[model samples]
Target: EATVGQFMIEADKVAHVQVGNNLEHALLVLTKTGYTAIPVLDPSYRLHGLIGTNMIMNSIFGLERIEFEKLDQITVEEVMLTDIPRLHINDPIMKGFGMVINNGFVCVENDEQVFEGIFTRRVVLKELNKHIRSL
Candidate 1:
C-alpha cells in the first residue's frame, strides 16, 4: 500500500457515533451502513470509544440471545468499548496495520483528541494495493 494516511486522506466520509446517542439509533445507523464497529465521539467530536454489534448484543440479555428493547434505552456509552486504540495522522502505516490487526480498527484522532477519521482493514488493503502498483 502507498500509506495509511494516503488513502484515508482521500476518503469523503467516515462512520461515527456520538457518545450520548441512543444505542438503538446508532445500531440503526450502523445497520444501514453495514459497519461492524463505529467510533463514538463527544459533543466536541472527540473520540470517546468504539461500539460494535458484538458489544451491543453482548451487553443485552447475554450472548446466546439479545434484548432489542434494552438497546433503545441504552446510550452508546453503555455499550461502547472504552480503552480503545488510536492512531494519530502522522503515525506510520505499520502502526495502523498493527492496531487494525489487533483491534479490528483504529480511531484516527488529532492532537487535541478530536475525532479525525477511521482506518479499517479495507483502507489498509487499499493503501497496500496502491503502493504495490506504484512500485
Candidate 2:
C-alpha cells in the first residue's frame, strides 16, 4: 500500500524557517528554494505554521508601496498560517486530498505528532505519470 510516509521528502532537506526569524530572512530562503510556501518550525524543529511569499508581502504592504523596511522587523511567527493541514505519516495518502487543495503540501508528522517532513503534490503527480506510462 502506498502511504505518505513512503513518499515524503525528509525534513532536513525541506525549505523552512524558524518562528523567531525575521520576514526578510524568511523571504530570502523561499526565493533561494524557489518555493511558493514554506513551513515555519520551532527552534527544536516542531511544526509551527507555514508562510507563503504572498503572505509576507501582503502583511507588509503599505498604502503607497511594498514595505521593505518592515520585512526586517517583523517575525514570521506573527504572519505564518496556523490553521493548516497536518497528517501522520501512516495516514492514507487519499486523506490528504482534503488538505492539499488549499496548502500545496501537507505537513507530515508521527503518531505523537512530532514534525517529520512534507508530502508534496508535485511528487505525487510525478508518481501518477509513471502509473500512466505502465498502463
Candidate 3:
C-alpha cells in the first residue's frame, strides 16, 4: 500500500522561512537548502505558503534598486503565493498522483491546520522503483 504517511520529509528536516522573515534571510535559507521553493510557516508552525527563488525574483524586479538594496525589509508575508496545494497525512497516495505530478511537492497537515511535513514526487518515484523490483 502506498500512503503519503509512509514517505515524507518531516517538518524538522525541511528548510523554511517564517511569515515575518525578510527576503534576505529567506534567500540565505534558500541557498543553504538548494531548493527552488520551500514552505512558509507561522510561529505556530501553521503552513502559510511557498517562497521560491522566482517568486523572490519577481519582487526584486518589481521594486527599485534603491529599495531592493534593503531586501531585509521585505517580509515574506507580503510577497508569497497563498493558494497552497495541500494534503492530509492520512490520505492515500493516490490523492497526490494528480497533485504531485504537477506541484512536484505538496504540504501535509492535520485538520486543525497543524503542519506535519511535505510529500514529494521524488519519494513516489523511489517507492515505484522498489515496488517494481519486488516482483
Candidate 4:
C-alpha cells in the first residue's frame, strides 16, 4: 500500500527552477545539485516542465559558437521538456515505478494539481531493495 507520497523527495528538498528563470540560473542550479533533471514551476508552484542538462545541451548544440551567450537570453521554459510524466501523490508505488522506468523520474502532484515533488528511479529502487531485504 506504499504510495508515491511516502518516498517522493519532498518539494523543499528538491532543486527546481522557475519558469521565468534564465538558462544561466537553471544551469547553475543543475550543476550545483548534480541532478540530471529538475522540475520547473511557475510562481504559483504549478508544474511547468522538466529541465535537464541534456535538454540544454541539445538546444544549443547545432548553434554557432558565437551564440553561446544566447544561453543567457534563454529561459528554462524554452529548453525544458513540457511533455512530462506525472503522478498523483496518493498513487501506488508500482505506478510510479512504471512511469520512472521510462523517464528516470516522474513529477508528483496533489489533487489540486499543485506541485508536490519527484520520484526518481534511484529512490524507487532503494525503497524496493529495502523491502526485499526485510523479507
TM-score of each: 0.83, 0.91, 0.90, 0.90
Query: Which sequence of candidate numbers ranks them by TM-score, best first?
Result: 2, 4, 3, 1
Residues 1-135, candidate 4: write the lDDT tens digits: 789998898899888999999888888898999988999999999988899987887776774443556678899988898888989989999899899889878999888768999888999889889989999
Q: Write the per-residue lDDT of candidate 3 for residues 24-95, one digit (tens) a residue.
A: 888888878898888999999998888887788778774455345667889999988979898888888988
45 in model 3: Cα distance from truth in Å?
0.6
Looking at candidate 3, the ten consecutive residues that score lowest on lDDT are 61-70
Who wins the TM-score comparison?
Answer: 2
Model 1 per-residue lDDT tens digits across residues 44-68:
8888898987778777876576788
Q: What are the per-model numbers of colliding residue pairs?
A: 3, 0, 0, 0
lDDT of 2 by residue, 1-135 (tens): 477887888887888899999999999999999998998988777888899899999998988799988798999999999888898888777776556666679999776556889988877778779989999
C-alpha lDDT of all candidate models, in order: 0.79, 0.86, 0.84, 0.87
Worst 10 residues of 4 by lDDT: 61-70
Clashing pairs in 1: 1-127, 1-128, 2-131
Deviation of model 3 at 47, angstroms: 0.6
Find the number of clashing residue pairs for candidate 2. Answer: 0
| Residue 2, model 1, lDDT | 37
